[PDB]
Amino acid sequence: VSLPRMVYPQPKVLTPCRKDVLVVTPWLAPIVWEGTFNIDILNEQFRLQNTTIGLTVFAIKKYVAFLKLFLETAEKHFMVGHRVHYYVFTDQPAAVPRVTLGTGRQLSVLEVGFCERRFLSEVDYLVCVDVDMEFRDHVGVEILTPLFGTLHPSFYGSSREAFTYERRPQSQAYIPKDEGDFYYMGAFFGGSVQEVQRLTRACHQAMMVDQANGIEAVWHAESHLNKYLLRHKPTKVLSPEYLWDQQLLGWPAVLRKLRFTAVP
Numbered sequence: 001v002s003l004p005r006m007v008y009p010q011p012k013v014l015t016p017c018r019k020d021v022l023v024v025t026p027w028l029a030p031i032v033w034e035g036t037f038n039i040d041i042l043n044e045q046f047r048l049q050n051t052t053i054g055l056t057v058f059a060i061k062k063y064v065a066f067l068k069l070f071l072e073t074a075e076k077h078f079m080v081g082h083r084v085h086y087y088v089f090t091d092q093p094a095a096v097p098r099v100t101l102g103t104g105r106q107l108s109v110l111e112v113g114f115c116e117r118r119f120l121s122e123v124d125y126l127v128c129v130d131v132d133m134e135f136r137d138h139v140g141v142e143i144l145t146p147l148f149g150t151l152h153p154s155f156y157g158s159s160r161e162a163f164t165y166e167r168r169p170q171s172q173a174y175i176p177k178d179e180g181d182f183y184y185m186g187a188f189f190g191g192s193v194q195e196v197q198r199l200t201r202a203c204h205q206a207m208m209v210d211q212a213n214g215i216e217a218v219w220h221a222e223s224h225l226n227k228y229l230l231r232h233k234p235t236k237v238l239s240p241e242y243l244w245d246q247q248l249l250g251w252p253a254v255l256r257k258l259r260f261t262a263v264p
Helices: 039-048 061-077 116-122 193-212 220-231
Strands: 052-059 083-090 105-111 125-129 133-135 147-150 188-192 236-238 260-262
Touching: 052 061, 052 116, 061 083, 061 133, 116 193, 125 193, 147 193, 147 220, 188 193, 193 220
Parallel strands: 052 083, 052 125, 083 105, 147 236
Antiparallel strands: 125 188, 133 260, 147 188
């Protein structure tokens, strides 16, 4: 459907939004920073498609303690105005806090000690994050795309030789020193349900192969995520605004917003 009439500042061809950072990858994927998007335009586009976003977290053992803040701050900052389905995987269904949700938002508790068809039927996009985190600012439809990864906050300024990729050729996650675009954070990735299932299926197969060969990648699923995203380029990359640790890294000038952060 057509967008409605909208009044907003004209984009200026000979004035970049941001001159201090790379805002597009060499495969023409946007890198999402504050100042690169008009959220009103993007909200219109995604609301007109009645977009539903799934947000998945695992909260096992003592990590259930993090759910209350995670969910309450997600209610303030994550996809507000859009349909949201939280999927909380836990070993302690009774320890999930009763958090008040806005209209059009739902939560499912899934007990762990099988979700492929359910996700396809229930949501358009899946977002996969860790629970020991809080939202502090807007995280919205600007992230949505067929496949996205997030720049790890410790490595966004680093040379590829310094990236902590798996370096042993015996592992399926192996990346040599002369390869690599970015070091993506394992704690924040997503995309369409189909692309997230393709990614998780490929990662699981690679991890099984490594297990059979008696090798475990240096950073576990994150190492495999990095290998997958090297060979299957993401269609957006999120800046470190989207995964930050203020205790460890402060608040650099290049970050205009701190959106989703570690709980110290």
